[PDB]
Amino acid sequence: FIYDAAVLNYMAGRDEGCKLVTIGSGKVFASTGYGIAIQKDSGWKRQVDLAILQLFGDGEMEELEALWLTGICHNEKNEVMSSQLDIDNMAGVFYMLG
Amino acid sequence: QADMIVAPLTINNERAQYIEFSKPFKYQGLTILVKKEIPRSTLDSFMQ
């Protein structure tokens, strides 16, 4: 499923059983962030930009991410929950006899 | 003395009130660098 990286990360982190993961462990391919679409040649653009840049300095953006965009599945950890040996997995042993 | 700046230059509130930036060409953040430890090894004789 090919979609935007700000939503697929949230869905994978809020899925029970950890049965959905993202290719590349959070990899993007066309980095373009969000934004507010003000009317062209408006007079509020400069005042809005200085307000957003102020929230980063005070640390008020990380709290919002922690409140809303927090997940529980530890898909970052790569420890596979056990495995079962099959013919393809156990293929070298037979070809040693081959 | 200069008309433009082409270098890694983070954007924040203080610098944006005087000069004008553009859309970032690199998204990143801040992190901490520390020295690694010696992995070492403890296996010399089978009497261990």
Side-chain angles (χ1 to χ4, degrees), chain A residues 1-75 80 82-98, chain B residues 1-39 41-48:
Chain A
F1 187 52
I2 310 177
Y3 208 59
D4 75 325
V7 174
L8 295 185
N9 286 18
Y10 173 77
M11 296 295 176
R14 197 63 73 90
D15 197 318
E16 83 296 334
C18 290
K19 297 196 65 62
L20 292 180
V21 81
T22 309
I23 283 302
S25 67
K27 185 64 186 307
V28 303
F29 298 102
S31 303
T32 47
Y34 287 175
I36 301 182
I38 323 178
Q39 201 167 257
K40 203 170 183 296
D41 285 330
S42 180
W44 301 87
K45 183 187 183 304
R46 181 169 183 87
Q47 302 151 285
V48 172
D49 299 0
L50 298 178
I52 296 183
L53 295 179
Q54 172 74 301
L55 271 52
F56 282 94
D58 297 358
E60 284 169 272
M61 283 297 189
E62 300 147 13
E63 312 302 321
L64 287 175
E65 299 182 0
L67 210 159
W68 295 95
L69 301 178
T70 304
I72 78 175
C73 171
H74 292 10
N75 66 328
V80 179
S82 179
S83 60
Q84 273 53 239
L85 299 171
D86 54 72
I87 297 299
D88 300 68
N89 197 337
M90 291 284 294
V93 190
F94 293 93
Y95 271 83
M96 176 213 62
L97 190 77
Chain B
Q1 308 181 32
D3 297 10
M4 210 171 62
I5 298 178
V6 181
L9 200 67
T10 58
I11 63 184
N12 47 17
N13 191 22
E14 285 75 8
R15 300 174 180 181
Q17 297 174 318
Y18 301 95
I19 79 169
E20 168 161 314
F21 293 106
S22 65
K23 299 301 176 183
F25 62 89
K26 185 75 169 183
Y27 296 84
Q28 57 99 41
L30 292 182
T31 186
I32 303 180
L33 184 73
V34 297
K35 190 175 184 182
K36 197 176 179 178
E37 88 296 334
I38 305 300
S41 180
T42 305
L43 207 59
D44 266 0
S45 60
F46 45 84
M47 293 183 172
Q48 205 71 283

